[PDB]
Design an enzyme around this catalytic site. Sequence first.
Site, mmCIF file in Angstrom:
data_model
loop_
_atom_site.group_PDB
_atom_site.id
_atom_site.type_symbol
_atom_site.label_atom_id
_atom_site.label_comp_id
_atom_site.label_asym_id
_atom_site.label_seq_id
_atom_site.Cartn_x
_atom_site.Cartn_y
_atom_site.Cartn_z
ATOM 1 N NE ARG A 173 1.981 -33.986 -47.735
ATOM 2 C CZ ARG A 173 3.038 -33.418 -47.159
ATOM 3 N NH1 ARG A 173 3.159 -32.096 -47.138
ATOM 4 N NH2 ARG A 173 3.978 -34.172 -46.604
ATOM 5 C CB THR A 178 1.931 -42.052 -40.780
ATOM 6 O OG1 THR A 178 1.926 -41.974 -39.349
ATOM 7 C CG2 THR A 178 0.623 -41.487 -41.318
ATOM 8 C CE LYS A 215 -0.708 -45.485 -46.563
ATOM 9 N NZ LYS A 215 -0.524 -45.117 -45.127
ATOM 10 C CB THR A 216 -8.195 -40.687 -47.402
ATOM 11 O OG1 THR A 216 -7.923 -40.627 -45.994
ATOM 12 C CG2 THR A 216 -9.643 -40.269 -47.652
ATOM 13 C CG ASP A 267 -4.798 -41.237 -41.235
ATOM 14 O OD1 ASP A 267 -4.783 -40.075 -41.694
ATOM 15 O OD2 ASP A 267 -3.788 -41.972 -41.214
#
Lengths: 191, 308
Positions: free
Chosen positions: B201, B142, B47-48, B93
């Site tokens: 991740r 999320t 995302k970031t 976020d």
Amino acid sequence: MIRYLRGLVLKKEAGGFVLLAGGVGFFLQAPTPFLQALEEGKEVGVHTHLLLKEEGLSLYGFPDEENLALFELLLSVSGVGPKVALALLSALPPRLLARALLEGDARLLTSASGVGRRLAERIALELKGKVPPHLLAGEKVESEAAEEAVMALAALGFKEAQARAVVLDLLAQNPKARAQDLIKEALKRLR
Amino acid sequence: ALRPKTLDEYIGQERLKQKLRVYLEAAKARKEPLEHLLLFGPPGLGKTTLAHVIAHELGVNLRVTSGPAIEKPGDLAAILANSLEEGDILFIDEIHRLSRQAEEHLYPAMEDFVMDIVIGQGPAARTIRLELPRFTLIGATTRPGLITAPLLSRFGIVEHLEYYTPEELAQGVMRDARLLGVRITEEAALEIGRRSRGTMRVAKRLFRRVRDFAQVAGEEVITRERALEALAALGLDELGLEKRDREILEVLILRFGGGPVGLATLATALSEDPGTLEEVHEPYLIRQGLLKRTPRGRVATELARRHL
Ligand SMILES: Nc1ncnc2c1ncn2[C@@H]1O[C@H](COP(=O)(O)OP(=O)(O)NP(=O)(O)O)[C@@H](O)[C@H]1O
């Protein structure tokens, strides 16, 4: 010389009224509008305009600097006197007259007591452009941008004082500070 | 370890792009403000780093802040009020979790770039306005479901995000083989690839700790032997499923049976934060013929037991 004065409305009149400022009963002419919103007995401030002559001295009063401004400016023109200038001022609202004067509505001018056909024209051609800095809208301050700043701050979280205590200190280092530029700049030091 | 931010250097899907790369082309067909971009799908997914990079291929820095990380209802205002440069991006976020109102004084920055601050004591007075610059907002969630209030309206485009295939993640891993003193092979790296549950991740976690480990620096090298070796070995886990996971199941299956339990008991019998369970473990499990959520409670799919 005399521009401002405070005193009682001692006695009104058709197109005049008397101001007992000091111990003196001054007699000044004013615009009908202003004149009517005038009530004997209550103190009042007047934006005056002396005027010599060949038989005496004349005083012309006005609601606010704005008006006074036009009255003079008006007298500025060749041929327009206190009466006329007064008419014009007594007819249409200053703002609208300021515009008119600038642009040149000899049409709109005529459209008013003391309705001058060609005069409205001279007065027009004559001040076209020559009118006016801060005179297209009656100067009127809103709320204390300062406090207003705070008030926002408080509602944004920050405990009042915390916010006020630094709004002030901000106006210090910088006296000129629209709430906006003030408020924001607070968030910075309030991070 | 910074990365040359681009879009040509972004390992990943080509769908959101078919409807975003296009609008990413609009910031050059109209102006700098590219409609509010919300993001869906499971964590890790990327995302970031997406917009963190999007920025550079736009011409403006990026400011990112977590949702819940907003106490002072004017903390965002501050995040909006002078700190940009007529383009910078603001990422939020966990955005779905914002103050009851904090998310309301967020619409002004939608239509254009304002932040009208209502105000009054009794009877209320007027309402203040600021002058937030023109910017692009990224507010990822999320768990969107039904927690991203009507504010979905104010947001521009709503595109989803999913898991990035054994290939794609494994792919990345490769370019990640060029770091600081380590060479890994492909097929091997394919191993890693499928243990990073469709997530970049969980796609680097494995090695990051590998760094400060004894019997791994002596055999630095990593081919499909060590790949599945110090992976099935002390990398302590087979196909993804690792220790705590086995433990879970172990308790799910051994103590209770393949039978249903319910976050309720289980999370406790697992001596764990019920939320933390169904949220940071139960996930992959389910999305991998293992865990099943039933109105009766959790249960173990056969492929779990025999699996061990
Ligand atoms: N698509 C990608 N290509 C290259 N590197 C990536 C990519 N996605 C993530 N990374 C790297 O992985 C790290 C962050 O992991 P990850 O949580 O998956 O992404 P993120 O965008 O930072 N986080 P999030 O917003 O929670 O999804 C950074 O050091 C990045 O360099």
